[PDB]
Structures are given as C-alpha cells and as structure tokens.
Amino acid sequence: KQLPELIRMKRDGGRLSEADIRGFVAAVVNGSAQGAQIGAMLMAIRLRGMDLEETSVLTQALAQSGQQLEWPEAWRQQLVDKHSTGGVGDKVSLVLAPALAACGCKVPMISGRGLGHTGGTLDKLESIPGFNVIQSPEQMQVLLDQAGCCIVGQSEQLVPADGILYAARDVTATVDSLPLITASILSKKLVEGLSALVVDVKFGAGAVFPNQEQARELAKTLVGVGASLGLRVAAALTAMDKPLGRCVGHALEVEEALLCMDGAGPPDLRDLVTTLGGALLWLSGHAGTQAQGAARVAAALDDGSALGRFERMLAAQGVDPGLARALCSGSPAERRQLLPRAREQEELLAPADGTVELVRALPLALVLHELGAGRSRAGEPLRLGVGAELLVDVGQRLRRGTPWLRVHRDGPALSGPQSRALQEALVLSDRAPFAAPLPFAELVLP
Amino acid sequence: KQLPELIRMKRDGGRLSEADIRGFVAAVVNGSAQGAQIGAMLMAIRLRGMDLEETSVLTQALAQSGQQLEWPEAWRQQLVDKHSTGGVGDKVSLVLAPALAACGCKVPMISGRGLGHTGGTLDKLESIPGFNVIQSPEQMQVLLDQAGCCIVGQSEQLVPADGILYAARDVTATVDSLPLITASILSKKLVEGLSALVVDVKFGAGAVFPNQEQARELAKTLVGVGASLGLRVAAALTAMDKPLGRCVGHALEVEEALLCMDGAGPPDLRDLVTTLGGALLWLSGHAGTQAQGAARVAAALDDGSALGRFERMLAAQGVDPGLARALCSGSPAERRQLLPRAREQEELLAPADGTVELVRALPLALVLHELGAGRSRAGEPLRLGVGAELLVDVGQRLRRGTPWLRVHRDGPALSGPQSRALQEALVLSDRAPFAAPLPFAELVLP
C-alpha cells in the first residue's frame, strides 16, 4: 500500500496491519512520506486511535528504523535509564544521568526536544555553548566510557523515525496520543539495550494527562508493552501543586540542575531525583530497596561526584573543557554569565496577603512557549534565555507587593493576556502556612 | 492564534473563526505552514468537518489568496465555466471549453490536476508536448482574445492556497470532504469573474461520492454558497457507474476528446458535453432553453469550429503551431503517434457469453492509478501514456474470449491482484442486449 491508502484506512477507524505500519515507518525514514502525509497520518491516529497490537508494532518499527546499540558484556547490568512523559520544569534527567553514572551505572540516554508546551532535555542542554546532541553509536561508547553517561537525540542512525514524527507531533497537536507516546518513549529505550527502565508519568494540568487514572492507563501500557518487548520497565505516577523546582525554561533549568548537583537546590527536585534514581537502582538490582538506592543517589549529589560526571559528559559531547569546568565549579552568578540570558526581566507581585496554595504550571508553560521557549513550527530555534523563576514556595505566607515570579523575556513586555494568564497561575488562600509537599510518586511495577 | 493552536481547535471539533481560517490560509501561502501542519489541518477538517459559515470563509480566503481576474466590460456576459467534482474518464472539459468559445463565449477555466483515483484536466493536457498550464492573469487575457478559451492551473498569482492544499489533499486521503471540495471548486470560479457557472456533480461508481444523498448535498452546498458569494451557479447531478466514453487516462482521453470535436466519438461523452454546455448557455442567457443551447453546442462539434478553437488554445499555451495543427487535423492513428504511448498493451477477454450490464469505474481507476496514471506523493510525475480503452459498450452482447478492455502499461505485466480487480469490473448478465443509457442529468438551482 502506498501512503494515501494507509492514511485512508486509519482515517476510517480501520486497523493497520504489521505490513502497513512498517511500510509507513519505512516511507517516513527514506523521505517518501511527505510532510502533509506525516501530519495526516498522525492526526488520523490521534483522532481514531490504535489498539495494543498496532501500538506494539509501531514501537518495534520505530526502534528498528535505525541501529540497535550494542555494548560490552561487562556493562549489561550497569545499563539503566529514566524517561519522562513530560512535566513543566522537570529537569530530573540533567541531574539523574550523571548521578547514576557516579553510582557506577551506565546511562545511554536518548532523549527529546520540546513537545507542545513542555520543554525537552535536548533543548535545555543546547543552552550550553558547544553541546552536541547528535552522537554516533560508536561515539556513545566513548561517552559511556568517559563519563558513564550521555544525553543524545534521535538521528539518522538512532530511531530516525521517532525523530521525524516527534518533531511533527510537537507542532500538529498530535502529542497527546497514547499509542504515539508509548511507541515514542519505548522505541528509544529499546535500542539502548538496558537492564532496567523507569518512566516518570506525571499528571495534573500542565501534564499530558490532567488526571491520575488517565496517566495510570499510560503507565500500565508502557510497562505492559515494554515487558512484552523484552524490557524491564517500571512507571512512576507523579503529581505536584507547582512546576518542579523554581526554574522553567532552558538555561535557567541547567542552572537549577547544577544547584542540585551542588548538594543544594529545591527539595522537590532533589526528592524526585533520589526517588526515581533509587527506584531504578532497586529495579536493576544495584540496591536492596528503593530507600537504599535513594540514599546512594543523594550521596552522589552531596560529594560532588554527580557534578564531576556531568562535567565529563559536557566536555565529551563538544563543550569546551575550560567552559565545562568553569560552569560546573562556578558560583550561581558565574553560571548565569556563561549561559544565555534574556535581555529583559520583570517581576510579578502578589496581589494580596495569602498562603501560596498552588502555582499552576499550565498557564506558565503556555506563556513561556509564546515568548520563545517553545516552537510553532518544526526546526524553529528557541530563545534559550527565556523562562521564569518562582520566587516563593507553595505553602509560604506572603505579603502583597512581594515578588512571586520573575519572567525572563527578550521582548519589551508581556502582552495583557499573557500578563493576566501568569497572574491567575498564583493561587492564594486564607489557610495557615504549611510545608511544601514533596512530589507524589507511586510506582507501577513489572 | 498560531497553527498548532488552530489545528488543535479543529482537532477537538471546535469552530474556527474568520480570523483563524484567514490566518491558516495566509500561513499556507507564505510558507509558514509546514507540510505536516497542512496535512494535520486537512485531516482534522476531514474528520471533524466545518459548518456553512466556516466553509464560506474558507472559500473566500482561498479566492483572495491570489489575484482576482479582471476582463473587458464587453466580455462580462460572455464569461462562463463548467467544473466537475470528478468522474472517471470525464473529459467533458477538454471538449466544452473550446466548444463554448465557438458558440461566442469566453471560458477562463482554472482547473486542477489529479485527485485521489480521479484524473485531472491539467494532467491530461500535459500529454500534449509543450502545453503550459501556468499562465499569468495578463497572458489569460491574450488566450481569451485568441481562442476564446484557456485551461490553466493554480499558481502564485491564481488561488495559490488552493493549489497547495489541493496537491496535499490528493495524497493524504482528504479529498472527500464537503467543505474542502466546495471551497476548492468555488474559489477558482470566483476569481474568474463569471456570469454563469455549472458544476457537474456525479453519484454512482464513477464519482467522488458514489452515494446519491452525499452528492445532492454537495450540489446544494455549491449552489447555496456560490449564490451567497455573488455567483450564478447551477449544479448537474449525474448518475454514472461506468467511465465516461471508452478511454481512461491522459493521452488517451485527449485522443477521445479530439474524436468528439471531430463530430464523432461515443454518444455518452457527446451527450454530456451538449447537456452541460446547453445548461450553461441557458443559464448565462445565451440560449432560450437548455435544448436550444445543446443544439448550439452540438453544431460546434459538427462543423469543426470547436476543434478550431481547441487548436488555437493549444498553440497559445505553448504547443508548437505545427504540432497543434498536426494533432487537430490528424487522423486517430496520427494523433496516437504524436502523443505519449505506453510501451506495452494487453487485452482482457470476456470470461463467458453475456450482455454487458456494467463496467465498474472504481476498480479501473484504482488499478490505473497504481500503473502510473495517479500519484502516491505530491509533485510526482505521471506516466501519461498509461490508461485503458473499453472495447465494448454497456448493453452489448458479447462472446467469450472477445477483448473487452485494452490496458496500456509501462511496467512489467499485470499482477494477480490488479488483473483480478480489472476482471471483476466487467459485469455480465443473461439479459437481452440494450442501448447504452445516456447520462442521468438533474439540474440543481438557487
């Protein structure tokens, strides 16, 4: 079947055969599938869905569209990874990859760019001058040899079909598809040759699933399809009454990740890194319990070894050694200097007295997207200095006129609608001040 | 709003504002809308639909995406056109444009290429060496001055937004959309500045919507939106289960068109040319009744004047004068020599005794599409010599082993599936032989 008939089948709510799916994926890889045919297929899938068998075949076809990664036998047990479905201000991966390398693991992370109103690890890393996200299978061997970790993107050799579709999904309103997400995440992790995978599936607005049960179905699908494809997968269901940490953006999130690797940073960020890291170390058999693993990851954050591994990864992936060292050993203020900065800053002030009940992630994601932190079309460059910093904690009592959000923007102003959208993100109440709740994190186990 | 937001709105079954539609159309024209975004919007519209107001605004936006055609005042009443929704083997337009010119009309026809499994007039004309379908607004003045007619394609000056979307729709299973068809047809006809339009909508196997109710609704929509936009439109709903005439393809359909302008050819082809031409002459006030108009058109087919006008149109649009003359004044055998020929021919024979009840148009269209008469991707060149000739009439009694279909192919030989698909197109029965019924033709008015 040529492309037009395959689209028509799915458009009508028909099931696509193994041959059909593999044919479409082949056409995507070789360029036969034109843009409009990719967008129409994606939308057909988004509106008409796929059953488990279709989803499973799509995952295999995307994985097999490039090369499978092979590693020394001695590494087989050390190979672990973590993936997120997406979360606003989630920079766990920047910290967790080098922290796990410091715990004697190997992390061959194939990651992703932005997707809808959620930022991607690859875009965050590109705020570091010279960082190269495109790395060959053999170069990835060297990186894992040098730093014990790497964070790379899809390319012509690695899951090229996911790269194409992901880039198109971002900008065509086809991100929030269960079969597409499953195939996208799992294809990348399948080619990595892992002993264990943890996938962090978050819910609550901002997220791909504003609802716990919805997200639960995705978590169970990821684990079920994962297992049927030979991979040891666990999911973590996570929720928050705020963005993760204080920084949303790209350069800003690198900065906060560096804070965490200093043994500092916000507690929620550290809690999630240690929780997910420890889950992984337990899952791969490197820790007796999740709690033992979490303490092991925490220790790596505290003794400079995670930071050390991160510096090695940066230099190994194209960052100038002098800059990588200057960035990692530098103070917060020196780091700000080395990374892209937005030309302008403004602070939003608290309209009244109140306890911060919540900082809504979604309105913040949407406004930052429009300011250059997201894409309206594929391949569009980002403004990596753009972002926002939360200046208050959830549960904190604050006075009126106290700054709660600093926005970093390249233009002269927030538009009225975006100024208003950001103001409505701040939820205040009469309640007594309380400790910032640590992220919800329930495991879905193999 | 930006495109992913526009696509998302339509994806969710939401209504797009006038501003939204115009923004999307603008983005298509200037290149801002990438292929994938065009495909996703088209599939969203295909699956979720548009209301009459949306459809009307989309028609206006496509019309206004290029130049409006202006003509001498003296031509205002002479300006007429006919458009089809599609029909396998429908070459009425190749004949009717010059025939109407011969009846003292002006026909500034903006037409189209192939669309799904149905061939387009512009691809048929391109089997004539040197024929240029791209003609500027001022060049069109010259053509109408020289031949009284022209057949041109969408370009950067003429309905560019339709050209883009039409080319995508062809290959993304988004052809059979009521709002997309209405907006596509009417936008082209609106810019021509016509005094009267006839749109030929078919139902039955040969049609875009074989279901009669779908076709009637499309006819009423075209007329209703047309009228509301200032255009005098009529529709002809014609049932047709078999291809029109005997030839399906491109070079082959030019050849059969030339037979009709010879005063010859098959009765169904001539009947439809005279029926639709006379409807038009009546509608524009050039004939007292449809029957008086049809006799007028028939006379132009009989005295060589339609053929004369067609030769002028060919030469004016780039065809070498010596070739145009040699083609028009030439015998059927000489014409075959001048136009592309497939390398190979094979005939399918009658499996038994029987009266031909029917030759199913759809299986024929689908097989010829696969042999190079159609596109699996936009901008793909066609094999213009490929096609098929019906060697029998419907209603004709035939013996077993008598050739009923001649297939002109460039590749190796018909496969098992396509050979079988063509054989099932021939419907035979025990009935007494009967006269080939002439096209059903019901006229829809505002």
Ligand SMILES: Cc1c[nH]c(=O)[nH]c1=O
């Ligand atoms: C939602 C999502 C997150 N991460 C991925 O790699 N793919 C996806 O589709």
Ligand SMILES: Cc1c[nH]c(=O)[nH]c1=O
């Ligand atoms: C079906 C169809 C026929 N002709 C056109 O110009 N557009 C269409 O969408």
